Write a protein that binds this ligand. Structure first.
Ligand SMILES: *[C@@H]1O[C@H](CO)[C@@H](O)[C@H](O)[C@H]1NC(C)=O
Ligand SMILES: *[C@@H]1O[C@H](CO)[C@@H](O)[C@H](O)[C@H]1NC(C)=O
Lengths: 178, 200, 200, 178
């Protein structure tokens, strides 16, 4: 066919916090992630989780393998820590903006290292949550990550929006207005 | 064909981050399959296993040990080697074929006029083809039947993140008459080309 | 058919600039011919004669007199009226047909790489179709046979001033392989489409 | 066919200086201009001047008609003069720039009112002339004009160029570098 690349086995782990993640993607799209604290596979496309199965244990093994490897590498590196990077976000509609017409607003945050972020939406300058969704930390070739959030809205009113990006290789949260 | 396989992360010999990447590259479907696993410490890949090379190789000093160890552990080195078949060949031909590869999302063509201008010199028509999967799509601007290529500008692909893309194609026009502006779109999910019309 | 006719500027009744513009608009060749003459004082058109209106009309106060006068001078008003046939019909079907309308200039296709980068994210290929007359031209970017429309951007037409135009079409690519990038061009002056090739 | 517009009879005239011009164009391209001080038709495309003829007298009549009309209008307007506009130029090659390869550089000056301009090229900052060519004052719908100049060059050396645009609805000459 065409070029296709599968991302099968992707594991992340961070030390203070024992925070980890495991995912699978195809052509840059997230197939599913495995809920670790509750040990279950969460398909981004439900219809997909009904035709194909992935036992969580698999993901769970790699997380352990990495917990293991982190402790070993951290030492080997004589404890060099992660140097911080500043993310860049982008807000845009998933569909043609029509007056009164329900839409979903998307915020694209890239250059995320580490996989620690608080991306937050607000017309106000204080939050509003319904239709607020998030993807897992998507992997980048340069070993940085990127995350997307959504907002479900219909356009006339209060119309000012903002995607607040809090990350410490960073300062103003990043208020990206739309 | 209903079980999705992972790529096993090896065990080393006995703000901090590590990443393990199982990556499988398919050239013309499963004709040529390539397996690349990478072990990352923060943002530095330290060791790698590549189908093309057949064995683990240290990318940096931090990886020198894992390579010499894993390559000598028959169980490990031989499990990884076959991982291109166990996980990739399997995941491609199996899971992916009944799911990602069969997904077809019909785009939504809509010509709007730049939010407020067609001013400051040369009117700009915008065609918005959104919510399609997969990415191969052909969108052309037409003028009364003649295909318009000059003054046309297309954005790069926009990956929405929900398994849908979108694309906007602009056309700066200096119009006249009963002209018709047809936004031709061609997507694999479609039987015959969808088209939207607009006139002066 | 070898004599080019002008549009006669009328005489008014007895840093400063004036302009007189004889303008003839041809819809589908000589099917519909329209004559518009304009008298300008600096940058203000003051009087106008339009085929569609049939007579002189003042565009501003400065023109009120010339209109009332010229319209009453049978010789003037009737010479201008027929000027659409004497000068336009004549100049189109006659001079212009054996000269401007028969001119065909074959363009010169050349793909170069942006002067120094294909950097900072996504390589940009540029096709330069220059030195063609007339302006109707069709330039398309292709990838291994498949017509590429996404990531493509074309400039507006560039009028050189010597009866030749040019046009540049960009393509931002994230390439791979024995890919071929064919810049398809289609100009009336050409028998069959000229094409240039480039590969990774 | 397609839309075509002929510009037949175009005359310009300015008062202090008795400076005038007469031209003919087709689809925005200059057919010819009539040399007034020497009473002869100068075809931009010579090959054209050999297949079609335009007696200069015609042009000459309109110039007179306008000389006439100017004196009358100027009075009628109670002598209001021309308000000055600032031109904008653009420099660009007529062909693909190849190292060592002869080319012609073009300078596009627009928004020219009045039809009085000194557009000048220089690598130096002092002129250089050969291949220096100019078009007549081309007419704009808004009754402003535009003029183009050319330069014949081969690209490696002294490589700095400049199109100097002197016009009094203007100040720095307009040094547009390329
Ligand atoms: C692989 O590519 C070749 C040539 O394009 C084709 O003949 C073959 O059928 C392809 N295989 C698949 C599975 O599409
Ligand atoms: C004018 O247009 C009509 C329809 O397009 C066509 O039949 C006719 O031949 C055209 N005339 C010329 C001179 O091209």
């Amino acid at each position: 066919e065409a070029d296709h690349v599968g991302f099968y086995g992707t594991t992340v782990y961070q030390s203070p916090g024992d925070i980890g993640q495991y995912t699978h993607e195809f052509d840059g799209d997230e197939l599913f992630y495995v809920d670790l604290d509750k040990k279950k596979t969460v398909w981004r496309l439900p219809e997909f989780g009904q035709l194909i199965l992935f036992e969580p244990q698999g993901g769970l093994q790699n997380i352990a393998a990495e917990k293991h490897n982190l402790g070993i590498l951290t030492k080997r590196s004589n404890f060099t820590p992660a140097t911080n990077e500043a993310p860049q976000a982008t807000v845009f509609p998933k569909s043609p903006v029509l007056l009164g017409q329900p839409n979903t607003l998307i915020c694209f945050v890239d250059n995320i290292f580490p996989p620690v972020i608080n991306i937050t939406w607000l017309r106000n300058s204080k939050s509003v949550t319904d239709g607020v969704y998030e993807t897992s930390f998507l992997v980048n070739r340069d070993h940085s990550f990127h995350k997307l959030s959504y907002l479900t809205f219909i356009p006339s009113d209060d119309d000012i929006y903002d995607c607040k990006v809090e990350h410490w290789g960073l300062e103003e949260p990043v208020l990206k207005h739309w | 064909r209903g079980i999705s396989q992972a790529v096993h992360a090896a065990h080393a010999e006995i703000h901090f981050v590590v990443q393990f990447k199982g990556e499988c590259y398919y050239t013309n479907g499963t004709q040529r399959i390539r397996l690349v696993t990478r072990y990352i410490y923060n943002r530095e890949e330290y060791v790698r296993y590549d189908s093309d090379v057949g064995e683990y190789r240290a990318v940096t000093e931090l990886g020198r040990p894992d390579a010499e160890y894993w390559n000598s552990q028959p169980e490990i080195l031989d499990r990884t080697r076959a991982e291109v078949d166990t996980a990739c060949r399997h995941n491609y031909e199996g899971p992916e074929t009944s799911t990602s590869l069969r997904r077809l999302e019909q785009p939504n063509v809509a010509i709007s006029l730049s939010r407020t201008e067609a001013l400051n010199h040369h009117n700009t028509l915008v065609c918005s083809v959104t919510d399609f999967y997969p990415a191969k799509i052909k969108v052309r601007w037409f003028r009364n039947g003649q295909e318009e290529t000059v003054g046309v500008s297309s954005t790069q692909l926009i990956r929405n993140g929900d398994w849908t893309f979108q694309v906007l194609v602009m056309l700066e026009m200096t119009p006249h008459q009963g002209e018709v502006y047809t936004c031709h779109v061609e997507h694999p999910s479609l039987k015959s080309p969808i088209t939207v019309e607009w006139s002066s």
